[PDB]
Symmetry: D3
Subunit: 305 residues, 6 copies
């Protein structure tokens, strides 16, 4: 079973499109899903091999039940809201996700145009973010973002559904959150204080050692080991976005994993805290304004419709 | 002696256009920023040399000029003139400062825009912010190659930079901006041959239609002007696509630089008001202007001294 | 595995196709060159890593096979079969050896071709030499993107490489070549919408025309065949433009690789002989085949051991 | 005043040389094409920026100049003069127009050549068409780096562009072309040391042989000329390999630009006819000229009218 | 797989080779660093993706192995064995740890080397540090292309990586290093043809000399070994030039990886000790080895768990 | 101009600095080499155009100028002056000739350096040889962006090239070199905020600290000097990191070019001797100068003519 392009090369541009399916829109949607791979080739092939255009399509829980019948992915549910003492992770509507990536924005925009052209009148846009790599893989807080992502076989094993849910092997679960940062507040910290929030050094991206890294740093709370001692990992492809006029500086978070349990555990630790940590310090400078969960099927599941 | 801003830029694949108004009381903050904007361009850009190709051209409008400076005004500076054609209208919208930021990548544009606006918050109000990108092989949203007949090298220097005619402001230029939104559904209902008739060139190969066959209300026909002496009058354009798929906005951000606005304004009159043989530029049947402003972009040394 | 030749190449922008026949007495010289051709590919190409992307696929025809080797023949190897259609003909021309040389620049191709022909001088007679070049947006001589639907990765391995069905020759492939000359004047008299109807895809955007609108005598319609499996039958193509402006020759060099010739031969029957609903492939109204040959491209290890 | 044609071009790895004669009656068609060839160059080349580096230099021969124009002639314009040397001969062959088309890739060259010949069909007859390719380390067909001592910047402007000495035609240049075919088997039978003695420079490192060991009949010896005041007389060359393996043609297409043909012609006389010290240029013992033509390449403004 | 280190790297144009010994008492510090060396490679290299191509391969010597680790030893690990030939000698020099750091640019190599040595200061003593750079056409200091016949893809995986013959260490490899200094004055007194006879390949075109002309004491002749197997025994080399023009040092840093040291050691014996028809490798008449060590480069996973 | 040497070079990422003394008897060898150094630069560089960007700038010291040439001296040419400050000292070390070799890759640098020193064998004695590499965002060894405020374009020509003040030597420049070694352990114990106060710019963003917070003893404060008119006096710098990890050498090789050495010497006096308001440049608390020389780099025409 061929997976979608969840494991992509590093790409410098992305469009994230989240839509809801209008009443009556189900058939239009199904026809599009069966064509999305061929549109990806048509737009992408003439810019090979530099273009690295790919589109990962995801389907939400309530939408899955309107479109298909029979067996469902084992872990597919609506994003679970987290009501922490201080910080909250909201859930927002989203039936379909298009995660469109390439080495240039225009390829992204051309593919998005074709997809929404086929869907006009069946869907309603909920979110559209045009993302860009910032410098040397930095995010909007000025830290390198991506460094501890798994690679190669460790990545395939962390992100692709296997034997545990055989009918959906080759699929993945994507969680999306749009975050806005309070840059004024962040920039009032010293660099050393910022490093204590993230858990790594700013200029060199070296992890802080275990004897200085705080329990409420981001890296501390998103490190999770499983009952057998192995690391529980996700694949992230966070993108900066913003608008200077509106003072909007953002990180669009997207995390892929073989089951939503992994991602959800990390989220609980960040928002709700642990025995030793009230919450992830990064949330004192970052507000989530969207939250959705999607299942990204194997490519063959979409071809056969 | 005088160093121009980077009006004549290499081809760049990302741009930010920022148009603001100066609030009451903001003038001093703005003047400090103008004198530092070249420094900020170096601070952001130098670490990404030589690939980055970051430049910022700063432009000042007619009313803002009188609030900011006294003494001489550049000879051609006035407010953008609204054009009320029989069918199509070129609006004038508010604009005191233009920052036309270009680079080979968006992040550098954004980083410089962030630094500029960081110094100016409290003193200005944003009116328009567009993030532009190059689309394929220099194509615009209508699917045609865009820029082909721009002047280059010495001809560009001569068409764009103020010289002896206004010696206090030699090295400056005049910029006209209009944000255009396209009706892509209408446009895509035309055959390719019909689209070529609107533009005046071939779509795939970008070869100009012969005199034999080019309509008089084609875009290329209307924007070709020879001056009293018989030589052509040229501008320098760096149009950028922009858009949002969910809102159905597909746009062209027009910016044209010229040594005097009279050239740009004549082209605009022809397009909106027509000629004896052409009611209006057919491109306007698929393109609506929603902003319009005119700025003077001084020589770099003018700004350095404040 | 055994190591296949570089049938599955990265995208390359230049090629040389060489077709020769083996003269009387030439077999020994040929067999020496075959055993060294991989090391000549590395000699010429290694110093130009990693941009060079130079490869050479060597193929052997049916008659030549029996002069060169004894023991088993590959299952599918036979002379190219002439197709005498009502209107269009697929001709057969002589060819014992194919060198399909690809790289990112012509000079590398030429350098390797020079070395190969150097070793063969006086053993072979050239029948065809074509210097091909890809247009800058993967377009062909007709102006359409060419390559889009080729299979990739595991699907390509499955469609192209001989496997368990003929185990002594696993890792090999079958190559069909035809040189096509186009009538560019005729083709350029069609509208874009008409040309799209001949091909089956949009010219500018390369999106496939939908099933409800794509004519049955369009190229894409006729070269889509499903097997008994239900699954599509695929080939791997690497068509290359060529020509000469002084002689008015504008051409497409077709080369198609498949795990058995039955796939390629079916497509050719459909194009040249037609189906229940289509007289012939409309592309042949603008394209004439003037060569036709079929080769087996053995696994690299087969050649190394001689 | 005058914008020259793109005589001083960036390094380009591909070229098409097209030489045609103007048929009886063809003069008007030619004139119309000349006035448009700059705009064809932009049409084909602009969309391939900035990599494409497409340019076309157009040149006109002496007899054709008389058919096309009246009024002033360029001072230096005359038909190529045959050299009948004791051993080697430089032939003169017909040609009224030259298109010297250059780019980073052959297809751009071909696209522009196609447009040009399309407009000239029926008015001209092709005499020569060569598709050139530079080897990857600026080597020529003989394996030597080719172009090392070309002038650059202001030295090149001084050497190639007509100035105040012929002010009606300032910004123009004179092009000489010769197609050479090589005897590769003879050449490859020389040791490297013997080859270096023919050329005048070291083969692998491209360092010039010192004055005390460079032969008098080496190529570099004979093509170094000083003028009355003792300064070097210089040309700009853009020699391209070409060939066909099937027909055993291995060639160098010579093109030299100079502000007057006297410089190029003197170098040619030294090569073909000899000096007191040297019977002839040793490179001609491996190279035969099979065309020879001379053209004036006007300032681009001259063609715009 | 277990995950190997990046033994099979893309082509890289810079390297640092660092050889250190472990001071007594330093073993715990070293074990900590080995468990973090992969994360340091990512911290330094991630921000420079994808062009940076920084990798670090870490190798452990025989005696160090015994001081550092509990369990079983790799089967092939021993001290480098001195070779005392009639004319030329391969010396064995001290080395407990090898860091073979490669990238597209020296700065990344240096930055990683700095971080590694930062953690080791006080626990190790530097024995050798070489900053290598590739000549622009993959040439070495003798002017010959270097790397041409290395194995590729699956053939490389098979020649370099320990498999089920030593299953606890599958995914490891064995590295041999020797620093060579050349007598450039002597070498440059040879004609090109005589140099070609020492190496066994053509200097300009890198084509192998034919079997009837290639000397038996040529480098290529001596380092071509067939196994008991019938077939070729291969190693993977990544030789780097280095030097200092003031000191007249012009060098080649030899590094060879193999799945067992037997292969590399055979080649070395042939070079230094000779064969029936060759006294020794002629290259050694212009090259003096001044270091020599052997290391085991474990699988990535082995190091992660310490 | 007469044609200057390549003092104004593009950004390059590698360099070799070679400083030598002329031995007795060496004068004529040196003179021959000077007249050929441009042609060596082309021989090594041409075949790697235009990616290579190889240049060599050749400079001559005061004492050596008198040995080599008769006739006029450059007005500004004198031995580097030692500065014996209360705390820090700028040493003067011997040097007759400087070769400042720059390119995009080290191997081109090394190849040209090899040719130059090969011609000078036996006539000169090497005093200093440094191989420099740029860190990947134009950062130096202290982690700051280095080069931001260098002049460009006509401002650079005006700052660095001799003109009509010394018309015989128009086109020349004056280069000062100093090799510095850094105390990295001390530097890394400062907070980033404290480092910024040493340099005078922000570390991450490279923005200049504002006049109200920048300390008087910061590097930027002390190296800003205004001339009689109130304009900035500028130099052109191309500082290069270098180092050796095993020897714990981390260095900055300083090279500054100016039209007269008075400008560079003023800056050095301020840094090392201090002013009324600054004891000395705080960068010297982390940087020790171990060489110091001054050279005149003539116009290229001057070297051709002999
Ligand atoms: C709010 C915006 C976010 C920002 C700006 C951000 C930023 C960062 C940065 C700079 C790192 C260190 C470098 C790296 O390894 O990539 C990192 C690591 C990580 N983040 Fe986040 N992050 C955000 C949200 C999240 C969320 C919501 C999750 C999980 C649900 C998450 C999971 C991770 C994980 C798993 C790691 C790697 C930890 C390890 O070293 O083992 N991040 N993030
Ligand atoms: C006469 C010159 C030829 C030209 C100029 C040409 C051009 C094209 C073009 C433009 C496409 C559509 C884009 C793509 O998927 O590549 C295409 C598709 C194809 N062509 Fe051709 N073609 C030629 C001859 C042939 C021949 C002789 C064959 C088979 C023997 C063939 C087999 C195919 C196949 C199999 C496809 C893709 C079908 C699918 O869409 O699933 N072509 N060709
Ligand atoms: C001074 C040291 C060395 C230099 C300058 C050098 C240079 C070269 C050159 C120029 C080639 C031919 C091109 C190629 O295939 O890469 C080559 C091949 C080779 N060298 Fe070396 N080499 C050196 C040391 C060694 C050593 C010490 C070994 C073995 C322990 C070795 C093993 C080989 C092998 C296996 C080949 C490939 C032979 C084949 O199958 O063609 N080299 N070397
Ligand atoms: C250890 C030696 C050095 C280091 C690591 C160093 C580093 C730097 C850095 C980081 C900057 C700020 C960015 C820039 O504009 O380049 C700078 C500026 C500067 N440095 Fe240095 N520097 C060194 C030595 C010197 C010396 C010895 C001089 C003068 C003789 C000098 C002259 C300058 C000048 C003129 C500026 C720019 C001032 C203006 O900002 O308008 N540097 N240096
Ligand atoms: Mg705020
Ligand atoms: Mg002190
Ligand atoms: O993250
Ligand atoms: O500096």
């Amino acid at each position: 079973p061929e997976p979608q392009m969840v494991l992509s090369p590093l790409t410098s541009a992305a469009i994230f499109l989240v839509v809801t399916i209008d009443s009556g829109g189900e058939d239009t949607v199904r026809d599009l899903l069966s064509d999305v791979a061929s549109l990806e080739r048509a737009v992408g092939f003439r810019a090979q091999p530099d273009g690295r255009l790919s589109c990962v399509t995801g389907i939400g829980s309530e939408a899955w039940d309107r479109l298909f019948s029979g067996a469902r992915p084992a872990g597919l549910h609506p994003f679970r809201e987290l009501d922490g003492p201080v910080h909250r992770a909201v859930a927002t509507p989203g039936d379909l996700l298009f995660h469109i990536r390439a080495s240039r924005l225009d390829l992204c925009f051309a593919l998005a145009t074709e997809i929404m052209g086929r869907l006009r009148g069946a869907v309603t846009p909920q979110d559209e973010v045009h993302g860009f790599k910032y410098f040397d893989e930095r995010d909007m807080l000025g830290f390198v973002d991506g460094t501890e992502n798994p690679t190669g076989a460790a990545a395939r094993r962390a992100v692709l559904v296997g034997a545990e849910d055989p009918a959906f092997a080759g699929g993945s679960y994507a969680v999306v959150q749009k975050y806005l940062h309070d840059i004024d507040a962040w920039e009032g910290l010293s660099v050393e204080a910022q490093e204590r929030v993230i858990g790594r050094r700013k200029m060199t991206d070296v992890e802080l050692s275990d004897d200085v890294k705080p329990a409420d740093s981001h890296v501390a709370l998103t490190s999770v080991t499983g009952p057998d001692g192995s690391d529980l990992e996700i694949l992230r492809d966070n993108m900066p976005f913003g608008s200077v006029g509106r003072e909007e500086f953002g990180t669009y978070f997207i995390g892929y994993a073989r089951t939503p349990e992994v991602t959800e555990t990390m989220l609980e630790r960040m928002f709700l805290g642990t025995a030793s940590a009230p919450h992830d310090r990064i949330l004192d400078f970052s507000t989530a304004v969207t939250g959705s969960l999607f299942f990204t099927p194997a490519a063959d599941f979409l071809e056969d419709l």
